[PDB]
mmCIF file of C-alpha atoms and ligand atoms in Angstrom:
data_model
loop_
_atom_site.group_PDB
_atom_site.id
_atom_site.type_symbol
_atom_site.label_atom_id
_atom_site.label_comp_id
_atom_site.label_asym_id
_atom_site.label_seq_id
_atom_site.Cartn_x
_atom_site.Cartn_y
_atom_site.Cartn_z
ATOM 1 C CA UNK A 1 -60.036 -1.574 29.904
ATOM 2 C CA UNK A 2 -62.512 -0.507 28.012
ATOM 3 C CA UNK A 3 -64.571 -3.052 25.201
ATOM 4 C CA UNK A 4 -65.547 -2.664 21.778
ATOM 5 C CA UNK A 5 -68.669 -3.771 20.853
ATOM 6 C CA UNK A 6 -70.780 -2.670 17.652
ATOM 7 C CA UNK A 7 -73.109 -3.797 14.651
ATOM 8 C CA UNK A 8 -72.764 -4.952 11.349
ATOM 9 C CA UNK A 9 -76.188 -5.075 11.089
ATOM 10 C CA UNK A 10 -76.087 -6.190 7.133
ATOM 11 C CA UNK A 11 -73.297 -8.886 7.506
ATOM 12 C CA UNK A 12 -70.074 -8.005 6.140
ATOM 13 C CA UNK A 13 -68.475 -9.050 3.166
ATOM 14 C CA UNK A 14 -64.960 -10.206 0.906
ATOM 15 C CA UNK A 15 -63.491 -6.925 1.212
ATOM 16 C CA UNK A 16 -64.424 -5.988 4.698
ATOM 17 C CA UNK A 17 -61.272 -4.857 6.892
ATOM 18 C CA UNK A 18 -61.318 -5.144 10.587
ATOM 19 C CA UNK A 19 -58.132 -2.422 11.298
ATOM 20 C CA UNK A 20 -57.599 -2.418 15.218
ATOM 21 C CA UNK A 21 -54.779 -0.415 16.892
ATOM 22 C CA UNK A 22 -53.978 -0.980 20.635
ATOM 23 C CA UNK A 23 -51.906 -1.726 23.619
ATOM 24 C CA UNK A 24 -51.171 -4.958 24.998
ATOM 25 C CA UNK A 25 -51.090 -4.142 28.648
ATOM 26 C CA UNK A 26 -47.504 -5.433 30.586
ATOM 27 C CA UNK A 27 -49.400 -7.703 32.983
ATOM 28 C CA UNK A 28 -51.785 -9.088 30.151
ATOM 29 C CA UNK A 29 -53.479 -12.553 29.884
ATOM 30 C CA UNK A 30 -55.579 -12.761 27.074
ATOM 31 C CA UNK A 31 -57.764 -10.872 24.829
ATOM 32 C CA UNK A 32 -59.841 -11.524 22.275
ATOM 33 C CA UNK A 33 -61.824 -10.142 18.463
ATOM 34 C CA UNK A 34 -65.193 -12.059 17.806
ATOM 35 C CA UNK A 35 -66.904 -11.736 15.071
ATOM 36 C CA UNK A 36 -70.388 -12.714 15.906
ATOM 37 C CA UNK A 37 -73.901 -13.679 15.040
ATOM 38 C CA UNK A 38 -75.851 -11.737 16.994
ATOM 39 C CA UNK A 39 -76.034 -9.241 20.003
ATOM 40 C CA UNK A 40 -75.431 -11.847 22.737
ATOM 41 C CA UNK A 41 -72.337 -13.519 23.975
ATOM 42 C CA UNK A 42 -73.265 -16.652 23.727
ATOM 43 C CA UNK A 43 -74.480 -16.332 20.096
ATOM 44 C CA UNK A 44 -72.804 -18.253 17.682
ATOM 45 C CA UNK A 45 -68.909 -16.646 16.684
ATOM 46 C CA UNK A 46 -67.677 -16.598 13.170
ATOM 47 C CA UNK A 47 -64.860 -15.934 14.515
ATOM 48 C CA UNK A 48 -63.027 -15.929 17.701
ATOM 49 C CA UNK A 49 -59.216 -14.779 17.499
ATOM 50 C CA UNK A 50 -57.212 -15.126 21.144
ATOM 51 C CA UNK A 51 -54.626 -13.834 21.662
ATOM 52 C CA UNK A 52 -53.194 -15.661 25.037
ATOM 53 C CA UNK A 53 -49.711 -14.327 26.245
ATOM 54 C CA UNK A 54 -50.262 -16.607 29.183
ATOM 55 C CA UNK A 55 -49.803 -19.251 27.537
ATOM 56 C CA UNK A 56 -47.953 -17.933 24.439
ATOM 57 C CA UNK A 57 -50.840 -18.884 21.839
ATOM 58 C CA UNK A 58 -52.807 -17.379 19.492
ATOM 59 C CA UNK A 59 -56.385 -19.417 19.206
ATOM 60 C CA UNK A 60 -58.603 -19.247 16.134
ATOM 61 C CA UNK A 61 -62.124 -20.710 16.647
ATOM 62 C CA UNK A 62 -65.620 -20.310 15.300
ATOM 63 C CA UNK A 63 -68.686 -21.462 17.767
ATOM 64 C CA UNK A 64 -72.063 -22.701 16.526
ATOM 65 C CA UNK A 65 -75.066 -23.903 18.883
ATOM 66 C CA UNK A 66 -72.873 -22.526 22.027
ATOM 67 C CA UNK A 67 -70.209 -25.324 20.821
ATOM 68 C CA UNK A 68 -66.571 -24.283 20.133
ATOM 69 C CA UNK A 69 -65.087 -25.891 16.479
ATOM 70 C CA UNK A 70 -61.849 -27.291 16.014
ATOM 71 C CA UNK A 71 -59.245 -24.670 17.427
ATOM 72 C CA UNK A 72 -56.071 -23.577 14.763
ATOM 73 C CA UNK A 73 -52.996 -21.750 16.326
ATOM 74 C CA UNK A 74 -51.055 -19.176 14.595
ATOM 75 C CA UNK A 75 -47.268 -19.293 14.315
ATOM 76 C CA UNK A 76 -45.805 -18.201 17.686
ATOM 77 C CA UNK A 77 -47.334 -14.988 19.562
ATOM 78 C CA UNK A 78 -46.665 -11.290 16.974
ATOM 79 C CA UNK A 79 -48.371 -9.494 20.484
ATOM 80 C CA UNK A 80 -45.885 -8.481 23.270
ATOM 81 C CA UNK A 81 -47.036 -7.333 26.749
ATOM 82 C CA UNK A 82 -46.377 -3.507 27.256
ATOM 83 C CA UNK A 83 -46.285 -2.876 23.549
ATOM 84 C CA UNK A 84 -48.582 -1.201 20.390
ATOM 85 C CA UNK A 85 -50.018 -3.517 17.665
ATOM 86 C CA UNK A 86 -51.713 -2.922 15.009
ATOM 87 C CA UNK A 87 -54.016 -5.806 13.813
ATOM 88 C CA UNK A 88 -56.161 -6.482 10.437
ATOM 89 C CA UNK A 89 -58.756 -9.055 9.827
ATOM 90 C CA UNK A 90 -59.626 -9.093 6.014
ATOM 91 C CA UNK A 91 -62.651 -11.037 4.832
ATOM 92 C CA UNK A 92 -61.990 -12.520 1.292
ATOM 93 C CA UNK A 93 -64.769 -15.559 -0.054
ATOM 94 C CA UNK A 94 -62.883 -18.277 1.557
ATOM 95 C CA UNK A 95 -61.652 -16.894 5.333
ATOM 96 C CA UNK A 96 -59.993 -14.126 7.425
ATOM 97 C CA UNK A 97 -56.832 -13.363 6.656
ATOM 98 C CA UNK A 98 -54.890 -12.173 9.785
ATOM 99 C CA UNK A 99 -51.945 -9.523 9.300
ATOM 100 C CA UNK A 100 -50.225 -8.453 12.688
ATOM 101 C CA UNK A 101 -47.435 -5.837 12.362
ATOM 102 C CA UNK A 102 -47.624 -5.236 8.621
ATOM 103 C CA UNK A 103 -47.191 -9.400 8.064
ATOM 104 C CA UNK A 104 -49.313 -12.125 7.185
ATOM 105 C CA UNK A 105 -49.597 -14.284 10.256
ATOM 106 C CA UNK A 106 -53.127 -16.712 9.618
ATOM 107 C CA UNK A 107 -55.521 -17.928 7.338
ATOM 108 C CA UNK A 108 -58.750 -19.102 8.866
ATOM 109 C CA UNK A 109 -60.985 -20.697 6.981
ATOM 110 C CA UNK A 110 -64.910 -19.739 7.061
ATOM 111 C CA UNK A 111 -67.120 -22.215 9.042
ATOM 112 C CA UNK A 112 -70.166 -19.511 9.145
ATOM 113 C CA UNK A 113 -70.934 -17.663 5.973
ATOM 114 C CA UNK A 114 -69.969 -13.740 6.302
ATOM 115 C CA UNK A 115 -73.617 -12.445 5.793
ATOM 116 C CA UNK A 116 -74.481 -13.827 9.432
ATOM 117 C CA UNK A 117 -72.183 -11.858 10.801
ATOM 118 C CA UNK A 118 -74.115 -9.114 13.344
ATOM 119 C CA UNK A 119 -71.687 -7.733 15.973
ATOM 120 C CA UNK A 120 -68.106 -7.297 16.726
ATOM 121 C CA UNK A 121 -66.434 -7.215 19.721
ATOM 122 C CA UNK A 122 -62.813 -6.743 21.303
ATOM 123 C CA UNK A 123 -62.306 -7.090 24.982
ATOM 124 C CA UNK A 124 -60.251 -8.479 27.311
ATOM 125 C CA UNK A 125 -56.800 -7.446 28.534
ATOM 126 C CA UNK A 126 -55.760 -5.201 25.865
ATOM 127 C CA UNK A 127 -56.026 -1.080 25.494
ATOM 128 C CA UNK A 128 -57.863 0.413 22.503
ATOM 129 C CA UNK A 129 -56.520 3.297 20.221
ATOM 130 C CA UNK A 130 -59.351 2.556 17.739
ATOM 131 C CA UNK A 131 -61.371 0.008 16.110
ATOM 132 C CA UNK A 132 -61.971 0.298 12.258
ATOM 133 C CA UNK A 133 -63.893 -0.956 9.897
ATOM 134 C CA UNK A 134 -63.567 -0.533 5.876
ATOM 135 C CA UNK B 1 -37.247 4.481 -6.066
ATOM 136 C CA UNK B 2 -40.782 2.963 -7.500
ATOM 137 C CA UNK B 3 -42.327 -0.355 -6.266
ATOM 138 C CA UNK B 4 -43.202 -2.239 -8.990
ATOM 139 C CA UNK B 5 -44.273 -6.143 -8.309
ATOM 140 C CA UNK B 6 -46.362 -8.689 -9.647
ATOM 141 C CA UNK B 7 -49.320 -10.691 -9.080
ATOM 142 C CA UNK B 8 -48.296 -14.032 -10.267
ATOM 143 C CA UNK B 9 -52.058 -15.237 -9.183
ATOM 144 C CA UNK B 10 -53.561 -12.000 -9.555
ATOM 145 C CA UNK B 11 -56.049 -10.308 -6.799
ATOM 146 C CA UNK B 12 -59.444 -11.336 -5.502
ATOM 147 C CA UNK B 13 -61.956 -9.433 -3.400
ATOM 148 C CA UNK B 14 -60.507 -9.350 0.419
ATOM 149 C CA UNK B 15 -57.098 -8.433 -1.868
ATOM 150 C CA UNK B 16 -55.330 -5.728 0.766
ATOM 151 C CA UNK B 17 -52.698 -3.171 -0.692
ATOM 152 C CA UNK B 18 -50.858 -1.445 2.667
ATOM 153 C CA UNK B 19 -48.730 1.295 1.520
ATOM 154 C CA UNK B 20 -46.666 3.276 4.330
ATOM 155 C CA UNK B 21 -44.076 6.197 3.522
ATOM 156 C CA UNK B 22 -43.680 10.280 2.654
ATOM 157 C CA UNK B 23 -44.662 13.068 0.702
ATOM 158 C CA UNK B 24 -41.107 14.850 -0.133
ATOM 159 C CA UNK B 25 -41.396 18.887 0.647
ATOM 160 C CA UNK B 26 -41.298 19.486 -2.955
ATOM 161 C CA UNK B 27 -43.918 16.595 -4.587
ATOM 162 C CA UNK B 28 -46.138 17.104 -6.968
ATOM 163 C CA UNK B 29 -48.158 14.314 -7.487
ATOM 164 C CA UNK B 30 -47.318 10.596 -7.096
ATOM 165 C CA UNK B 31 -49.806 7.383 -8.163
ATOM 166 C CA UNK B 32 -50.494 3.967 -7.229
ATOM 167 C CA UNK B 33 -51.509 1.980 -10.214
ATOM 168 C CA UNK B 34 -53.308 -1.697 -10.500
ATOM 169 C CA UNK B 35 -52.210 -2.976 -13.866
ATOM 170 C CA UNK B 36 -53.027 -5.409 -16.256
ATOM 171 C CA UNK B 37 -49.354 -6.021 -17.286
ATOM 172 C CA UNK B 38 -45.872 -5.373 -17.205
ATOM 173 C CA UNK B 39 -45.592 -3.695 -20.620
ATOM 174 C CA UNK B 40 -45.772 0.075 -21.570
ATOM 175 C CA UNK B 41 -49.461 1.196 -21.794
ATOM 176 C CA UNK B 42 -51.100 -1.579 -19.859
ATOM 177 C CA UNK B 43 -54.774 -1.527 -19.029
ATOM 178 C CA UNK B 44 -55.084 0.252 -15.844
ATOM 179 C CA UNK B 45 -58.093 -1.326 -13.602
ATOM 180 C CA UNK B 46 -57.169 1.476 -11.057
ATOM 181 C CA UNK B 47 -55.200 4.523 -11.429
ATOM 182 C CA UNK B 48 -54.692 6.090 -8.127
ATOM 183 C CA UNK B 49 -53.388 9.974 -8.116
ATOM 184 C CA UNK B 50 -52.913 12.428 -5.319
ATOM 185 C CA UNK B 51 -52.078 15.956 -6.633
ATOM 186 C CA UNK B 52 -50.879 18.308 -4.075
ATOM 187 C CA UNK B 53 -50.163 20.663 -7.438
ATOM 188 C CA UNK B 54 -53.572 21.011 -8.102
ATOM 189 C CA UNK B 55 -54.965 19.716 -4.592
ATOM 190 C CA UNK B 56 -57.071 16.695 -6.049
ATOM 191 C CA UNK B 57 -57.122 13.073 -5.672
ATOM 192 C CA UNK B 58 -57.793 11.492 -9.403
ATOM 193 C CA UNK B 59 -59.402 7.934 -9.504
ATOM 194 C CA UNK B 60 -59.253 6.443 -12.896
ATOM 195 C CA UNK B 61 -59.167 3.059 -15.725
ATOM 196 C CA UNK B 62 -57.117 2.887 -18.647
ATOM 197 C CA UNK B 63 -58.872 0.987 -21.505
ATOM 198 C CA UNK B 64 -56.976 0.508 -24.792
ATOM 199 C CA UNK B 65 -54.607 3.049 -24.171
ATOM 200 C CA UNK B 66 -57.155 5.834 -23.070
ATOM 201 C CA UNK B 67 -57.945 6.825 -19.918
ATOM 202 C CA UNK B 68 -61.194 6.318 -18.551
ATOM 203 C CA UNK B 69 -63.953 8.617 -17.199
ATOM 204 C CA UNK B 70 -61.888 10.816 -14.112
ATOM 205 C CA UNK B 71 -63.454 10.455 -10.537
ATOM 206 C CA UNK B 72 -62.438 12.488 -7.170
ATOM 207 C CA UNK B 73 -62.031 12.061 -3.575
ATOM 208 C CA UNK B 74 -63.194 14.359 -1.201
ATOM 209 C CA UNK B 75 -60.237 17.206 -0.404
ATOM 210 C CA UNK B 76 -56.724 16.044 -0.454
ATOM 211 C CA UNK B 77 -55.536 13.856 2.668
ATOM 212 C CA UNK B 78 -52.039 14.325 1.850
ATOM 213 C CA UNK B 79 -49.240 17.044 2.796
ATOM 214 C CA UNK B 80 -46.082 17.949 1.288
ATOM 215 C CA UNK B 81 -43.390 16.851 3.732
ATOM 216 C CA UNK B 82 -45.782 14.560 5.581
ATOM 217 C CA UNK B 83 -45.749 10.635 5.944
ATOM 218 C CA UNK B 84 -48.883 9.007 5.546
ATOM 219 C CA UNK B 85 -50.710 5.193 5.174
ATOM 220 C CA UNK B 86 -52.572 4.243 2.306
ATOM 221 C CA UNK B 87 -55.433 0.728 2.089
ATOM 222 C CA UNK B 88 -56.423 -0.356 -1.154
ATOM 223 C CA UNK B 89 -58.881 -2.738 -0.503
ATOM 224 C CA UNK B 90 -60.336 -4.971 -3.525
ATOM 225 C CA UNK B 91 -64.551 -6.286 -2.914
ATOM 226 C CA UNK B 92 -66.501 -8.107 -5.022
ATOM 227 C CA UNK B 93 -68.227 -4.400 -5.976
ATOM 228 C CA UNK B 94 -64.757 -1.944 -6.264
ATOM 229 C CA UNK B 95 -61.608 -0.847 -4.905
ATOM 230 C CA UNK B 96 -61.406 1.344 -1.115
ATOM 231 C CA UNK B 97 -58.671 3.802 -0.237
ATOM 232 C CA UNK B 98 -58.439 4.189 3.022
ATOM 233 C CA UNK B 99 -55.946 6.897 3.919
ATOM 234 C CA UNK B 100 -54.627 7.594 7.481
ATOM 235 C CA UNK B 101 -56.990 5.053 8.969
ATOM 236 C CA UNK B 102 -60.213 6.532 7.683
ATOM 237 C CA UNK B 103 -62.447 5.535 4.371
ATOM 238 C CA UNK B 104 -61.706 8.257 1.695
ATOM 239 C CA UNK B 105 -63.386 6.999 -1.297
ATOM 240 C CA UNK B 106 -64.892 3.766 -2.950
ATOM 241 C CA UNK B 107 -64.219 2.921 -7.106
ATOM 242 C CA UNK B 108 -66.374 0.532 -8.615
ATOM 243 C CA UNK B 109 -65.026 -1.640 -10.781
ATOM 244 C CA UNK B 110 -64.466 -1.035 -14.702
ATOM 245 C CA UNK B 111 -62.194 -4.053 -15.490
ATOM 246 C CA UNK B 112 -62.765 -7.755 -14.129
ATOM 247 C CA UNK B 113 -60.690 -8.182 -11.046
ATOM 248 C CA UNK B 114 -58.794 -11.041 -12.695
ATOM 249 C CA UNK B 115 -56.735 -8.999 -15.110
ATOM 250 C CA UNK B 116 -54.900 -7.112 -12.218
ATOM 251 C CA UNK B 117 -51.480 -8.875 -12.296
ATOM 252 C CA UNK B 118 -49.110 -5.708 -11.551
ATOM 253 C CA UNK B 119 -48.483 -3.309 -9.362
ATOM 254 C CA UNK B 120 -46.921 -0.112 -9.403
ATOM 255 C CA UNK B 121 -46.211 2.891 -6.741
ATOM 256 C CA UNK B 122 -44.560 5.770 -8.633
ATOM 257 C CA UNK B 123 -43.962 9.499 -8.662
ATOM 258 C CA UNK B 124 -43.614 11.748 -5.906
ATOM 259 C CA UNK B 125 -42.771 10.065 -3.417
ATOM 260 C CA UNK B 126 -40.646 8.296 -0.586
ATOM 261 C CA UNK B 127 -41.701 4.558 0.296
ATOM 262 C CA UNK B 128 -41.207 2.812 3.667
ATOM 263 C CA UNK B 129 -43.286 -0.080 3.089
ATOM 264 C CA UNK B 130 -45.258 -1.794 0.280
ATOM 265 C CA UNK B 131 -47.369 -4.848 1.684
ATOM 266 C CA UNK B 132 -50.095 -6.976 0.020
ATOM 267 C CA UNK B 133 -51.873 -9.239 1.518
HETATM 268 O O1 LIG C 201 -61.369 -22.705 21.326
HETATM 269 C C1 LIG C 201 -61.537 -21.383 21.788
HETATM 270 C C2 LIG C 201 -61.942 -21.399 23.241
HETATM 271 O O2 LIG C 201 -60.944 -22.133 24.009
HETATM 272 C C3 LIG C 201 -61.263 -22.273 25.468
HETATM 273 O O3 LIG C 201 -60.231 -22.894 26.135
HETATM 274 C C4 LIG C 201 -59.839 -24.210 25.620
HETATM 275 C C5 LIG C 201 -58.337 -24.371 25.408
HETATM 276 O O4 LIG C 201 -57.784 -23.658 24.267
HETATM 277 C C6 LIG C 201 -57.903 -25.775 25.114
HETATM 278 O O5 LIG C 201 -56.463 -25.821 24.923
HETATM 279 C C7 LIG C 201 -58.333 -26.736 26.212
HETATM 280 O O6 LIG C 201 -57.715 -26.425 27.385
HETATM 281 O O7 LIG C 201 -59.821 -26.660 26.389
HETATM 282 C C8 LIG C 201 -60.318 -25.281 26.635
HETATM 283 C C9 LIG C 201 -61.820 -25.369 26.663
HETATM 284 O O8 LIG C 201 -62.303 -25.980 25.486
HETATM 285 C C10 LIG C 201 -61.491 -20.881 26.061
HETATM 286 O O9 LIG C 201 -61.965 -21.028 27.418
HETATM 287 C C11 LIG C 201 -62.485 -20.093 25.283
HETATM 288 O O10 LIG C 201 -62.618 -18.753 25.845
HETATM 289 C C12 LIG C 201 -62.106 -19.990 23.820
HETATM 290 O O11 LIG C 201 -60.891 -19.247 23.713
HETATM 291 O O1 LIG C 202 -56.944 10.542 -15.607
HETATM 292 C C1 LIG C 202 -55.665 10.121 -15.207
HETATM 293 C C2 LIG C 202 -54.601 10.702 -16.085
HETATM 294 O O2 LIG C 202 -54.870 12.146 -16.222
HETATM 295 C C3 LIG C 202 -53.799 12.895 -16.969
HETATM 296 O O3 LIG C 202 -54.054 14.230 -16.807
HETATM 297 C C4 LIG C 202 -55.060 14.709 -17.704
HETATM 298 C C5 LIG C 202 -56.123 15.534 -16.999
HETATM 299 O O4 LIG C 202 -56.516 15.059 -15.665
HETATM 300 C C6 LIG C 202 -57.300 15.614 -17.928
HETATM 301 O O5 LIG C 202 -58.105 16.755 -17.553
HETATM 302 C C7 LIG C 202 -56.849 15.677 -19.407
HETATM 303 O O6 LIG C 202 -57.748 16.374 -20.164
HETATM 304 O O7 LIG C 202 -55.471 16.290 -19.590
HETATM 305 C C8 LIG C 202 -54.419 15.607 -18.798
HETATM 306 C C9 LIG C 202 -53.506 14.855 -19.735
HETATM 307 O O8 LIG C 202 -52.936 15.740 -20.677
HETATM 308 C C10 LIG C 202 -52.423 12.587 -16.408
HETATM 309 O O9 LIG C 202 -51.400 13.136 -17.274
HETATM 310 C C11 LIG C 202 -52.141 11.125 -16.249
HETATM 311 O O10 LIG C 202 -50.847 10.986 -15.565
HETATM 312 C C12 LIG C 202 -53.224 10.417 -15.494
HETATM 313 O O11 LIG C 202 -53.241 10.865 -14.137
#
């Protein structure tokens, strides 16, 4: 499927909202949102959400000097392969709140402050209606 | 029926208000109001107003019982008979509304952020969801 991948070249701030709207394929794995610090791959992540119907997990991780932090899970898996999702990722002063289908479903906690934030991606096994952000 | 709920710990920049639902055939306007209280004649820190009477969307604040300075949006991205999704997104700098998925217009702040501690969705209109989160 096809990736998102574009700047923030000023950082983003409390306030900013992430709005994606998709389509978990029905023979999905994995995809993933990162939020990172620069136009590279390997560049440090702010924030790495993962959704893994695999192995019926959602992962929440920030990376810094190519090492991956101490990994939260959400509560149980709000994707479903074959179906339409809508996902937000506010930014308030003290972490990402993610909302899947109209409810609250994590609080992550910043590791990396917001203004480092360069580039945002969304790839993996997962269809894209659009990518927003506000 | 209005939504009207409160904000026991009020609202703080990254503050999301989702609301989801219709414009009835025969509306004429309908508002979404950030409140300072749950009285009569609060302070309003934002007074959100689509018209389809006159075809306007009205931003405002209510300070000791007068209303503030009017702003506008740009057009009116509402439609008698229509559902639609409203964002209200509180920053550190002002309040978004983000209608059907796209940015419609930004209001900077007038009151400190810490007085909003009530919500209110009235007039004109049919709710199927109000969310904050
Ligand atoms: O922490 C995010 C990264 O996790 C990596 O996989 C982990 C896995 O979650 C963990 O349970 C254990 O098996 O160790 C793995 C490697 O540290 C992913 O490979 C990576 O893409 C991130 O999602
Ligand atoms: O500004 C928000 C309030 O406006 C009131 O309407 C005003 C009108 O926009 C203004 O031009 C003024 O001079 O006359 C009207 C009041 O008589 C609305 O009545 C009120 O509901 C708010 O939307």
């Amino acid at each position: 499927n096809v990736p998102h991948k574009s700047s923030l070249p000023e950082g983003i701030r409390p306030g900013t909202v992430l709005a994606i709207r998709g389509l978990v394929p029905p023979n999905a794995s994995r995809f993933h949102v990162n939020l990172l610090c620069g136009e590279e791959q390997g560049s440090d992540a702010a924030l790495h959400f993962n959704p893994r119907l695999d192995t019926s997990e959602v992962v929440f991780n920030s990376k810094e000097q190519g090492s991956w932090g101490r990994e939260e899970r959400g509560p149980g898996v709000p994707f479903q392969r074959g179906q339409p999702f809508e996902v937000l990722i506010i930014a308030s002063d003290d972490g990402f709140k993610a909302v899947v289908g109209d409810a609250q479903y994590h609080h992550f906690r910043h590791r990396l402050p917001l203004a480092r934030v360069r580039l945002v991606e969304v790839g993996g096994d997962v269809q894209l209606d659009s990518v927003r952000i506000f």
